[PDB]
Design a protein around this ligand. Sequence first.
Ligand code: 700
Ligand code: RBF
Ligand code: PLP
Ligand code: PLP
Ligand code: NBG
Lengths: 791, 790
Amino acid sequence: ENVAELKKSFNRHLHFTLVKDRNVATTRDYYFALAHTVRDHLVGRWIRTQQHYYDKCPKRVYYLSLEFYMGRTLQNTMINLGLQNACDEAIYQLGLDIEELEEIEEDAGLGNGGLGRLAACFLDSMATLGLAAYGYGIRYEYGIFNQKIRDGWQVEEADDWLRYGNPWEKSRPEFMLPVHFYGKVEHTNTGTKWIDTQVVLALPYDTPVPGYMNNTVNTMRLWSARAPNDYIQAVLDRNLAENISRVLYPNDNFFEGKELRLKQEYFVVAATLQDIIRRFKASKFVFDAFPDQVAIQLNDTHPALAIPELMRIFVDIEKLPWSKAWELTQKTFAYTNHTVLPEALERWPVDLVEKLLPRHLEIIYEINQKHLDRIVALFPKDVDRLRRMSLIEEEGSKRINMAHLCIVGSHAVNGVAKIHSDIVKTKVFKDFSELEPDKFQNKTNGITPRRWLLLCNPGLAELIAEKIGEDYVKDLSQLTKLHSFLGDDVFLRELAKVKQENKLKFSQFLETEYKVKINPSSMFDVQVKRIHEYKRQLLNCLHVITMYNRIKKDPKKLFVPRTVIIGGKAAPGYHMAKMIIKLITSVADVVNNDPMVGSKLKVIFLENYRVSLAEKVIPATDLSEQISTAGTEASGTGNMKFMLNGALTIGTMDGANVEMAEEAGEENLFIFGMRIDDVAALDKKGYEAKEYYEALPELKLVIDQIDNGFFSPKQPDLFKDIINMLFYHDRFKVFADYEAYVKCQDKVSQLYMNPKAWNTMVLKNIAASGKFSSDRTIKEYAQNIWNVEPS
Amino acid sequence: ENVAELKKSFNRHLHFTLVKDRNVATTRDYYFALAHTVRDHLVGRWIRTQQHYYDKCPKRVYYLSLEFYMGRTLQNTMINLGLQNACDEAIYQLGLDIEELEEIEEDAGLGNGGLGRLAACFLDSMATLGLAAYGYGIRYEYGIFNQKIRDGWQVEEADDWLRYGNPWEKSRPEFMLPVHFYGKVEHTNTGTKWIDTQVVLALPYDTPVPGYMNNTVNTMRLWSARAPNDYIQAVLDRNLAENISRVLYPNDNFFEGKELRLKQEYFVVAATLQDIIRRFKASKFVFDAFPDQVAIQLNDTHPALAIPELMRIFVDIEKLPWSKAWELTQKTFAYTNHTVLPEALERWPVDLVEKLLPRHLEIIYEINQKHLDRIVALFPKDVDRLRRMSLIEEEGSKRINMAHLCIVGSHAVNGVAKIHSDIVKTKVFKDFSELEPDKFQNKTNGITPRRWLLLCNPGLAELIAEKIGEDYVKDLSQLTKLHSFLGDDVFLRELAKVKQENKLKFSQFLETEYKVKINPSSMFDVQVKRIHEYKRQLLNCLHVITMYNRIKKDPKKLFVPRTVIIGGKAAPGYHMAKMIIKLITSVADVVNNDPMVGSKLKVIFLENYRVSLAEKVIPATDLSEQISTAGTEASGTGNMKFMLNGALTIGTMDGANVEMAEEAGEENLFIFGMRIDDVAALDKKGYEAKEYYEALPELKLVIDQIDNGFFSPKQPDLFKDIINMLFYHDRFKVFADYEAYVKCQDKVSQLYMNPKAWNTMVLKNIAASGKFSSDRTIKEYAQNIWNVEP
Ligand SMILES: O=C(N[C@@H](Cc1ccccc1)C(=O)N1CC(C(=O)O)C1)c1cc2cc(Cl)ccc2[nH]1
Ligand SMILES: Cc1cc2nc3c(=O)[nH]c(=O)nc-3n(C[C@H](O)[C@H](O)[C@H](O)CO)c2cc1C
Ligand SMILES: *Cc1c(COP(=O)(O)O)cnc(C)c1O
Ligand SMILES: *Cc1c(COP(=O)(O)O)cnc(C)c1O
Ligand SMILES: CC(=O)N[C@@H]1O[C@H](CO)[C@@H](O)[C@H](O)[C@H]1O
């Protein structure tokens, strides 16, 4: 009945929408035909959901982020709507392979990593929980670049994801808005005027966000820059305004103070706030109840400008008195802190802001005066306190500390993991938290069980549902029921078979994609995340070389075989990250082609790591590498995906790793290396990498091989830069955790030789992953920050 | 496809396609819902038509043009498909106004004027005649600019026609192709290689072209430039390649040798030829029969590069020997000449071509040598003949004469009107026509009766069909049957009522759009075409001022009232055209606000003249101004639209105007002024505008008022530039035709006072318009140049 109508709709779309028949249709046409067939099932509910929010007017949540790492939409939509099985059958009956059609879809890679994926995971949870929430960002013409490996090096290729069209976005021409830039401030008797500005239009594109089996369809609104309204040159120059939403800055945890980036931040903030204000004034709910109807979450400081923009609107446009506007503003905004790394901190030079946003610079100054006046009144003698709490930094050049603007403009500030939120509250912003202790909170990150379990690992989800029901999908805490099977050998072998099939499926991937032959029974050791010195795939590379030498030493020694996979993109300007990639492809080349090691150890640099590819490798993983230096990874989410999918974790007591051990029992994770306190002690005492290289014979060998050209014969000093940083500038102490790491790694393999105990531990991990659902994360945000409830 | 199912489809699209309901839908959503509803009716026939061409493999026609002035598509499609009445009813039942929805659609203004509209009219006729024809152009992101009038001056606004989406285009991703630029030529032992080039991808977008009531749906394929595959800057720099299809050059009859324009020309040529070759090799058809399967018409010299590109492909890629390739090339191409005006002539500097297209420059040189060798062999003593017939001009800087390249690479060359084709053949290219007399031809232009009668003037089409049947739609020569009603007073009054209702409808337009109050019973005097010194709306402006003074002179004099309308866009760099516009808005301001003239004379500068707006004003017109200097307007097509729609013509013996008099009887048109020979005689003898200003008292007054600030008090010398050109540099002799013009105009008004005789003449015009159908034009092209059949 349903299968029949689905095949009918597909043929209808292929004909009328793609203008094709079965003899001339391309694979891309079949994908689009299916996408349209599935898309139609979203319309009724999307209209009803948005209409419901208008009628019953519940408090609305607006997740304002410069990034939304959404991945592919077809499968996700089919699943949340309960149409996957019917569609799978419809496509099969028509003689096609749904998997092939699914591969046609481009990832919507409008994010760099964890930050943009958290936003994506949050949209899915907010819809599944039935909250009146909206995602607001920029519709980048180009997302995170596609990565290629040339002569072992990363090469960037433009990610032209819209070239063939996106059936999942809906232009909303009637809501276009003008955004202002430059110009000059004019203080009149009717109020202050921001005049002589250049205008860039913002056209919003709505993408539906289907809740998991609940008839709710929320919206993700992305803005695209358009020019307003020598002739030829004047028309070509329209490219200049449209360049604002042209490309996503491909840096993870790195502030790049480019003027264009500033424009993107203001662009999305101005369009968004105007749209929210307009929706408020049409709600039939004059802004007294604004914050009882509106909640705006600042995802990192990127949209910090939203604070003085709201004030600008309230004061300059709506004519509200400063005091009242300031109060509403704080009740409206909440700020989420995502990192304590110095290079990620946004500090915009007042000069640049003055030229681009002169009125906003005056507003920020005013906020700062009112702010410092309060502090001067309570702590008179304390002069330096004012210096430390100011939104303005006069170090060399004067600049705005965006993080401080976010704190004073918000009623709630949160970190993303216990350890991180603690550091944010008591160390980094001690001066602020002391004054307003109730302001700072923690909201441990999470991942959505739909995309990261049900979609990416159907085999595992089925096994679990077979044993404990399907309720866990909407309430992952349900996974603890998996404990009852701890001594169940048949279940443990079923668990091990699912993982075995994931590995085989992914092995097929690696062999067609890459030269090398993979040992499907080897242990899959994986580290996939953005290349960073702080995340240390370098430390991992030190271990791979160690295992290499060891085999070369004693060839016939009983060695648990491994397929080591390291994948991730480096920001374009990050030289060390790029050197580390080359170092890894070099090592692999030597290991994979050495006859004495052969099928014992294989190394793969998984290129173009991205959301759709994460969905493949993660379910096939046995060992998840989460080895950042303690105190560096604010939270992490990749660690959670691997835990939910049956992999054991080797890592430090950092970010959310700590809470994973808490939930699963430290004994059921391979924790190692320095802890927050240990890195501190070492810092005070002073770190000298040279000493470990001295003490550690296995390390000295690894290092001498790198620095001598053993892994770059034609370029003997190619890795000279890596050697120098490690010996004289390693802020992340690679050599200091090397011994504990290799020791920890040895124990992992020992446990791997015992299938029954390895799988018993995996079970304890999966049964303990319930806390890491973004459904739980969102619930806490909802009741402790946004003050909202399901609809 | 009746009313109930049409309303159903509309609601379905509004819901699933526009994601709306009746309470939140916008007017734009309603337009799109209807467009999609109508579009669906094209799919079956479009797939079957293209499939038919593959199976039965008839010789195909490819109209290669840098311009396609298509206008709006909804109404046209509804009409050619016989769905207009049903849709009209469906939309009405749903509580909407189809006229309002139709106004939402943007014109597809991918052309400047006559040249691009001729291409558009040809696509409609080729589909109605059932020919296997394709239109190949560039999908400009921006078409001809939208014109605004600020402080009486034209201002240009970007024509962002794709902003909200084009439901009539279909991306054809599987046929994307790479186009090459720059690089360098490498002569090897395996053949010549064009290497180290930069690549720009070309993605084609197909638009259906429905034939009139015949199940045929052809294709118009437009190419869009896309880049292949410091980081941020590198991605932004992708804008540079995509800039190739960014904007239409807004010049009419004017060559602007900009490098970007050269890129556009090669771009469309390279993508098009590769696509045609590929389709040829898949036809199930050896390039021996290539020209028996392919015909490529060069619309003006703009795609001239297609000749050495085809050769490049045949020789460098397909490895054919030069002689064989050259033969197939000539049998493939045919060239159409659209103008004899010097500023429109394409002469690209060999330097620029050398850098951008080094391999094509070598090919053009080779063609020129083989060409001159032939001429040297037949006319040894004649040295200067070689200089005159060369594709290369060494005057100052060396440059390529694109027109000469088109002549030698084509087997047929045609003009667009008898008088023009004659000049092209015997005067301009005498050296070539003498050698190959059979090469040069004429193919008088035409307009499609669908868009230009049935669509734009439903009232007239109905009246005609009521009296002589509907066969005239597909065979306009049928209009001669209208003669039988020449003495029929009731028919003549019915004819006059249709024109009366057009005027009222358009008057509603002019009053809401413009301040002024219009006399619906006044004579609508109209001149709408691109602003050009050669088209002379200036001469027209001299007459308006004349009528003005006359009224001021004798207020109570019996004067047939007029609503004078002049509209058109000036190219951005054309200073004189812009000055003339300002001069016209200035005059209007004075006339329209002068209490002594009042409702006697009103002047309007119809802004943003374009295809959809032509469809409104043309049917409402009584008098059509076709007054270019004799010998300047190669043909004209606006003249034909007005004739088919019931307007009388006042004009010179130029372009197709001459043939209009031939068909309708010179007596039934208001011809005047110098003729081709008269302008020549005056040229030899020397023209001195000062003498007419001397002799003509009415003229002297007009001129003194202009030059003294009567029409620009705050800027007394504002029109100084206009005065100078008219006295010392008027290549188009405005003062010389002024007297004959005003005299001719006086007679027009005299005939207008006699409704029965005016309408009797209009009837003789309409009944004689059959020759000007583009169906007849295409039939002649098909049997005498392309050698193709339905
Ligand atoms: O564009 C059409 N369908 C659309 C269908 C579509 C819509 C959204 C996403 C993917 C596909 C189409 O093919 N594309 C939009 C993409 C782009 O903008 O690049 C590609 C279309 C159907 C049709 C049918 C007729 Cl009869 C005439 C013109 C037509 N265009
Ligand atoms: C038929 C014709 C077309 C012209 N088109 C243009 C044009 O498109 N742009 C421009 O800048 N000038 C144009 N001109 C003006 C020309 O370049 C030159 O400036 C004047 O003719 C010198 O008086 C045109 C002139 C003529 C006669
Ligand atoms: C989850 C995810 C990340 C974040 O990974 P971490 O290891 O937690 O930094 C990055 N990239 C992609 C594509 C992801 O799916
Ligand atoms: C037909 C047409 C033209 C050509 O008119 P002429 O009077 O022949 O110059 C130019 N522009 C538009 C919009 C047209 O419809
Ligand atoms: C170069 C150019 O645009 N020429 C124009 O071509 C059209 C189409 O043939 C003619 O009707 C017109 O008189 C002529 O001015």
